[PDB]
Copies of this chain bind each other. A is one copy, B any other.
Amino acid sequence: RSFFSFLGEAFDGARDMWRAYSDMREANYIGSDKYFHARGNYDAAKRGPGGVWAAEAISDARENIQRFFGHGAEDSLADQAANEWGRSGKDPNHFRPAGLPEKY
């Protein structure tokens, strides 16, 4: 039964990762990147082990795709630290920009 739960946690983790980027686009707040990268990872990790796995799979692929197209080396490191913070169960609101609406 644990395998089927792990997969459900993974798809749910995938949806929470998607929700973070969907919200990032909606907010349109400059310098919110770190907050949503931590939140999607935090939410996915909260689903369980499948969520942790899905968040890491999605974060690594995103980082690699941006790298290929022209995303700066130092800029990728900041994205990497924000993902790890959330995934480790630490508070995403740590990277929260001051004027971001309560919904996010």
Q: Any chain B CB within 8 A of the CB of A95?
A: no
State how many angstroms separate the Cβ of A61 from the closest Cβ of chain B. Answer: 4
State how many angstroms separate the Cβ of A94 from the closest Cβ of chain B. Answer: 24
Residue of B nearest to A61 (CB): B57
Integer count of this chain's copies in the complex:
6
Q: Is there an interface contact between B25 and A53, defined as CB atoms closer than 8 Å?
A: no
Segment at the interface with B among A3-11, A34-42, A78-86, A96-104: A3-11
Residue of B nearest to A9 (CB): B25
A3 to B49 CA separation, bound complex (whole angstroms)? 17
Cross-chain pairs A/B with CB under 8 angstroms, 19 sampled: A1-B66, A3-B3, A3-B69, A4-B65, A6-B68, A8-B21, A8-B22, A8-B25, A9-B25, A12-B22, A12-B25, A25-B47, A26-B47, A53-B61, A53-B64, A53-B65, A56-B64, A57-B61, A57-B64
